[PDB]
């Protein structure tokens, strides 16, 4: 949509780009959401998707309270991170250069985690950078653990999960390569890339 609209209504697209890019950070969330919704309608790549936030905000039940919902959201990332190493035993998790991903579509978990975390923690006001940092730290520790042993069946595709961590850091804007280097050397990722390419 962005490519199509670029050569159709350049004036409106240019005004939107300037409006979004130069929006002050100190502004409230309501105005920012309005800008993102308009930006999304224009096809721009907003970091936070207003549509996801709106869809996720329509939920309620008997035992729902703000404090327990926040705890559930925080615990969801921990569960995902601890479950990530289990993919190493999957045969269909073989990364291939011809696909730049995996046959089981596990390379899209990076954007799924980022979008889900951003929407959940902007609804509940919780910080995003700190939460993502904790998720990366837990994932890095677990990924190092699984690679420590030498079981053939359990670690058949350990390289594939390593590339997933690299994808998570790259796609995530709140996460920088400096944090990954502190918690995960880039040497392992380099070796994984060589092994799969072979």
């Amino acid at each position: 949509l962005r490519d199509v609209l670029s050569y159709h209504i350049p004036f409106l697209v240019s005004s939107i780009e300037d409006f979004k890019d130069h929006i002050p950070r100190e502004t409230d969330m309501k105005v920012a959401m309005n800008v993102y919704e308009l930006s999304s309608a224009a096809g721009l790549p907003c970091e936070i998707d207003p549509a996801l936030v709106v869809a996720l905000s329509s939920q309620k039940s008997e035992n729902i309270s703000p404090e327990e919902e926040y705890k559930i959201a925080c615990l969801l990332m921990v569960f995902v991170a601890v479950s990530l190493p289990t993919l190493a035993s999957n045969v269909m998790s073989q990364y291939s250069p011809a696909i730049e991903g995996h046959c089981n579509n596990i390379h899209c978990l990076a954007k799924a985690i980022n979008q889900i975390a951003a929407a959940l923690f902007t609804i509940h006001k919780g910080s995003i950078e700190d939460r993502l940092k904790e998720f990366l730290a837990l994932a890095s520790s677990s990924l190092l653990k699984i690679g420590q042993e030498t079981d053939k069946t359990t670690t058949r595709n350990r390289e594939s999960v390593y590339l997933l961590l690299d994808m998570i850091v790259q796609e995530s804007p709140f996460l920088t390569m400096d944090l990954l280097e502190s918690c995960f050397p880039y040497v392992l990722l380099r070796n994984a890339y060589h092994a799969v390419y072979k």
């Binding site: 190092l144 690679g147 420590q148 030498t150 995960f184 040497v187 380099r190 390419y197």
Partner: protein, 719 residues
């Protein structure tokens, strides 16, 4: 103003976004100072270049500038004869001292007295220094020609020369004339002494034990042991001593040496030169009639391709174990850091040894490629395959990746190492030595008393500043049942003098009635356990120096030895035959995605070579040559990288925009369009810290300029 206040200011920066061993100790130091001077004379010879070519030539006797061309040659090559005088004087004195030391130590007292282990290693390094210097003098040729030109010029000018000057000049010419003069002089002065073969056997036996038990941490020491063993064997053969008779007497085992030579055949002496360990055996006097005993001469395991699986597995497991270790802890944690640091250094040394040994073997074994080519071309360029080059750069990248990690943890490593050594030494001295002291006190063992007291007085630390007076061991009576003593805890390592003295005393207790016959089982078992565990304490204390020395790969560029063999028709080899460029060029031309990210690790080798030359060689023309080579090498690398990046992206866009139905129909017909293989230029593009020759280079800017020009050209072509 105070240590605590200064530490707080520093912390703010971090948040920002017996007289018998005294006599031997003095002798050991004297030999060490001589070895350093010998390496300086060895470096002077290796960095020697023909200065006579620049001197103008005279074709007729009527030249107005004949006298002046001779003045010139003399000034220029005067500073070079003076150092030759010093070198000849140094080697003459060094041989005299070595022979005298052997004369002192070969007396009948040897049958009773034992000799230290560090001393024997020093002697081995001494003879190795003689061997390398002899090779440098023998192989070098420009030295003799330069001296001859200077002598002729002086004679023509008659620089008012006197009787002693001509005698010295004639002596130097003969000294450089004689083949293997150093070896012949040493052997002649050593054959007179009777029993020198026994001391040589002890040195060889010590080297075998060290090599077998992995008693080393740096590749240089590993190669030194083999060189010492080979040189010692060559010296043993002669008109007085025979190795075969000694072997039949069980004094020396030759099977172990043969197996080691078979496994490893080539070691580097100094610089690009190499020595075949089997050469010493070939030159043995008694080798002709007993050549069947040695099987290492006949020539299978240097294929680095098949040795990469273990390297990758070892690299991954160590990194995984280490990455989790990125306000006081238990001694177990410090011990784990001690073990991890030792394992990392050992792994780095093993990788470095593999790379260097493969390079040395390939150089010694040239191939038999066009009809016309230089020896360097045949030795390096055409002896390497694509798989071989990829493996070498992979090992180099792993070495550097682990090196940077260890350097970052240097602070934590240093604290753990210092804490562990202090605790182990104090606990051993204050507890493990109580029982032997009690036994010696109970039954008069004055000899044991002196050594134990010296060990417990040189390094022991007392919390109260004095030795307790209630110790049962001192009084000689058996201890109750505990008399527990709380040793102090701190992070500081023993001094070099203290560590050497305690080790010598500790290892003097254990020797081959003897002084070891009055000790029980458990007492010794701890003694040797500490003896074999404290060797690396000094190495680990200076972690930074050990790490850089272990990860040194500055010998992959120097080629002075091959330049001399070109008969002076070459100033320096072209960039095509240097190893770092070959590896980089091969990666770029092949455009292999797997090895794309390893190119940078193959280009910073120039930094290591430049640092080694400046720090050790103390020469400048080598640095200038490095900069000139890098100047064009980087430009070629940038040009190729930009061109392939632009082509790869352009084809990707074209294929991505192409219709899929047409592609499927073409594939069914039999005219499928092959897709473009993916690459990994992502890391290269984002790089902005290409450090080379102490300079920061923005690779992104250069790639942007090339791509911008290419895009403009394409648009103009389209129109």
């Amino acid at each position: 103003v105070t240590l605590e206040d200064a530490l707080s200011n520093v912390d703010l920066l971090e948040e920002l976004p017996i007289a018998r061993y005294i006599e031997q100790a003095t002798v050991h130091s004297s030999m060490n100072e001589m070895l350093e001077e010998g390496q300086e004379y060895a470096v002077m010879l290796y960095t020697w270049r023909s200065c006579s070519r620049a001197i103008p030539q005279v074709k007729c006797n009527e030249q107005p500038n004949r006298v002046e061309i001779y003045e010139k040659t003399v000034e220029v090559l005067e500073p070079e004869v003076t150092k030759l005088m010093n070198f000849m004087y140094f080697q003459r004195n060094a041989i005299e001292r070595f022979c005298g030391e052997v004369r002192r130590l070969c007396h009948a007292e040897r049958r009773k007295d034992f000799v230290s282990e560090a001393y024997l290693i020093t002697l081995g390094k001494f003879i190795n220094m003689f061997a390398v210097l002899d090779e440098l003098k023998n192989m070098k040729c420009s030295v003799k020609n330069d001296h001859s030109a200077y002598k002729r010029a002086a004679q023509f000018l008659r620089k008012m020369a006197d009787p002693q000057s001509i005698q010295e000049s004639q002596n130097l010419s003969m000294f450089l004339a004689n083949h293997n003069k150093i070896t012949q002089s040493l052997q002649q002065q050593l054959e007179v002494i009777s029993g020198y073969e026994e001391l040589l056997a002890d040195i060889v036996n010590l080297c075998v034990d060290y090599y077998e038990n992995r008693m080393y941490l740096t590749p240089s020491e590993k190669h030194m042991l083999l060189k010492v063993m080979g040189f010692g064997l060559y010296l043993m053969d002669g008109s007085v001593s025979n190795i075969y008779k000694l072997d039949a007497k069980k004094r020396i085992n030759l099977s172990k040496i043969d197996k080691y030579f078979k496994q490893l055949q080539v070691v580097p002496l100094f610089g690009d030169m190499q020595i075949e360990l089997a050469r010493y055996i070939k030159t043995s006097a008694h080798y002709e009639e007993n050549k069947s005993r040695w099987t290492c001469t006949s020539s299978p395991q240097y294929n680095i391709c098949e040795q990469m699986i273990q390297i990758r597995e070892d690299h991954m497991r160590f990194i995984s174990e280490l990455a989790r270790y990125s306000a006081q802890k238990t001694d177990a944690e410090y011990r784990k850091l001690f073990d991890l640091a030792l394992q990392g250094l050992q792994l780095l040394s093993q990788w470095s040894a593999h790379v260097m040994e493969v390079y040395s073997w390939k150089l010694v074994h040239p191939t038999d490629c066009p009809d016309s080519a230089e020896e360097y071309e045949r030795a390096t360029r055409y002896n390497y395959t694509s798989e071989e080059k990829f493996a070498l750069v992979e090992v180099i990248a792993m070495i550097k990746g682990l090196q940077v990690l260890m350097g970052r943890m240097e602070s934590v490593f240093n604290h753990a190492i210092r804490h562990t050594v202090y605790a182990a030494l104090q606990d051993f001295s204050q507890v493990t030595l109580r029982e032997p002291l009690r036994q010696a006190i109970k039954k008069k063992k004055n000899v044991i008393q002196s050594v134990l007291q010296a060990i417990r007085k040189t390094v022991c630390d007392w919390e109260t500043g004095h030795e307790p007076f209630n110790d049962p061991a001192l009084r000689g009576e058996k201890d109750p049942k505990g008399f527990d003593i709380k040793v102090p805890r701190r992070a500081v390592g023993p001094s070099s003098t203290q560590l050497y003295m305690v080790r010598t005393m500790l290892e003097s207790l254990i020797a081959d009635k003897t002084l070891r016959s009055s000790l029980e089982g458990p007492t010794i078992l701890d003694i040797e356990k500490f003896h074999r565990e404290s060797f690396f304490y000094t190495h680990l204390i200076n972690f930074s120096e050990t790490l850089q020395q272990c990860c040194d790969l500055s010998q992959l560029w120097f080629r002075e030895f091959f330049l001399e063999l070109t008969m002076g028709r070459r100033i320096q080899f072209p960039i095509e035959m240097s190893m770092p460029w070959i590896l980089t060029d091969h990666i770029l031309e092949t455009k292999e995605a797997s090895m794309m990210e390893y190119v940078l690790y193959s280009l910073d080798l120039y930094n290591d070579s430049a640092h080694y030359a400046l720090t050790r060689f103390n020469k400048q023309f080598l640095y200038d040559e490095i900069e000139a080579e890098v100047n064009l090498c980087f430009d070629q690398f940038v040009y190729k990288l930009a061109d392939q990046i632009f082509a790869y992206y352009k084809v990707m866009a074209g294929s991505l925009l192409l219709d899929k139905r047409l592609r499927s129909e073409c594939k069914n017909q039999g005219a499928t369009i092959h897709l473009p293989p993916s690459n990994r230029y992502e890391t290269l593009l984002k790089q902005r810290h290409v450090q080379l020759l102490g300079r920061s280079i923005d690779l992104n800017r250069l790639i942007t300029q090339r791509v911008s020009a290419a895009m403009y050209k394409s648009l103009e072509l389209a129109i």
